[PDB]
Amino acid sequence: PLPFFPPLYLGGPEITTENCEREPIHIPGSIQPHGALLTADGHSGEVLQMSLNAATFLGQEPTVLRGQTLAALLPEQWPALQAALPPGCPDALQYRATLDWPGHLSLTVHRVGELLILEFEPTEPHALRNAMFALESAPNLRALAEVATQTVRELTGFDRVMLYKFAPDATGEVIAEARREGLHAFLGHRFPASDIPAQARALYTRHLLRLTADTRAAAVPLDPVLNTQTNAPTPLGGAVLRATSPMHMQYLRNMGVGSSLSVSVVVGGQLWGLIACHHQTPYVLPPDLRTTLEYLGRLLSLQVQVKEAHHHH
Numbered sequence: 001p002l003p004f005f006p007p008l009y010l011g012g013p014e015i016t017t018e019n020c021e022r023e024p025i026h027i028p029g030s031i032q033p034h035g036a037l038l039t040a041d042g043h044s045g046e047v048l049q050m051s052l053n054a055a056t057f058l059g060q061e062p063t064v065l066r067g068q069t070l071a072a073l074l075p076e077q078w079p080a081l082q083a084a085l086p087p088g089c090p091d092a093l094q095y096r097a098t099l100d101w102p103g104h105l106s107l108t109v110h111r112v113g114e115l116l117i118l119e120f121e122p123t124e125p126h127a128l129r130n131a132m133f134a135l136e137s138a139p140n141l142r143a144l145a146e147v148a149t150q151t152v153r154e155l156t157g158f159d160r161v162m163l164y165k166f167a168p169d170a171t172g173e174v175i176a177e178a179r180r181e182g183l184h185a186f187l188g189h190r191f192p193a194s195d196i197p198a199q200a201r202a203l204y205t206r207h208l209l210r211l212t213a214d215t216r217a218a219a220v221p222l223d224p225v226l227n228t229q230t231n232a233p234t235p236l237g238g239a240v241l242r243a244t245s246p247m248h249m250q251y252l253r254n255m256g257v258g259s260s261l262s263v264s265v266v267v268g269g270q271l272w273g274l275i276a277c278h279h280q281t282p283y284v285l286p287p288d289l290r291t292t293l294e295y296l297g298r299l300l301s302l303q304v305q306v307k308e309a310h311h312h313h
């Protein structure tokens with residue numbers, strides 16, 4: 001990725017089709033409204049930043065919340081959370097726990113350097129393990145691609161699931177499409193490299209899933225916008241509740257897409273393509289289904305690696 005522009009809240013340039021690759025998508029200082037986000041110190045547990053919609057999801061508000069520690073707010077999680085995410089642990093490692101404030105809320109924690117980042121969202125799978133050998137017994141790559149997208153579509157219920165594949169020069173192709181009936185096909189159509197730009201592809205090699213639950217949903221800011229640990233922007237690259245590039249949201253809206261989700265197909269640490277999903281209406285894929293998709297993305301990743309790197313016999 002080319003060196004990123006400062007974010008808008010630090011007086012950075014407006015994003016246009018000419019400057020694309022340098023939008024700092026990983027630091028929008030805001031999240032998507034269907035969840036809440038705290039950041040806490042990785043040693044003390046003191047909550048530092050807090051998305052200002054946190055009231056809606058946590059009972060007590062930013063007026064009486066950013067003081068006290070994680071030890072006091074999540075007393076039965078804090079110990080396990082620390083052991084799970086030790087200092088130096090990799091970015092994409094995450095602690096999960098379902099818990100009910102007065103119910104049922106999904107907690108996802110990960111650490112960046114010395115910051116713990118906590119995502120909260122409402123919540124309450126084997127139909128995968130069945131269509132498992134359909135993937136295994138697929139004759140070739142095209143057949144593996146169609147099985148993959150049909151399978152995702154059955155789990156998720158999404159209107160359109162595609163398998164997007166990157167050429168050496170970074171331009172993509174929709175090599176498989178499973179879709180609601182009546183839609184004009186993308187299957188076989190090719191798109192410029194800039195449609196998923198270098199910085200995004202890169203964020204997408206080490207953060208395998210990302211979504212826009214609602215394409216016409218205002219991002220809610222973190223307060224304060226900067227990490228008080230550092231006085232710099234907060235990395236949200238690994239926070240699924242991360243606010244999406246407003247530019248990409250426009251492109252989604254133009255396609256009539258209310259909800260978007262993609263998962264990365266990585267072959268040998270090098271981004272192979274994406275399972276890309278569209279849905280006509282705003283939709284929050286539940287955390288359990290997202291977990292099933294991350295898993296499917298890893299398996300599909302390895303199935304692609306053996307099937308494609310044996311298009312030799």
Ligand SMILES: */C=C/C1=C(C)C(=O)N/C1=C\C1=NC(=C\c2[nH]c(/C=C3\NC(=O)C(C=C)=C3C)c(C)c2CCC(=O)O)/C(CCC(=O)O)=C1C
Nearest residue numbers: 020025186191194195196200244245247248260261262276
């Ligand atoms: C720099 C301006 C941009 C132009 C012009 C553009 O086309 N994209 C631009 C910026 C970004 N795109 C981002 C993500 C992204 N783009 C796509 C593209 C497609 N989706 C489709 O369905 C099809 C064809 C049928 C195409 C070509 C995808 C799949 C993704 C990411 C995955 C997803 O949202 O599903 C992006 C990053 C977004 C983010 O913040 O995560 C930017 C900045």
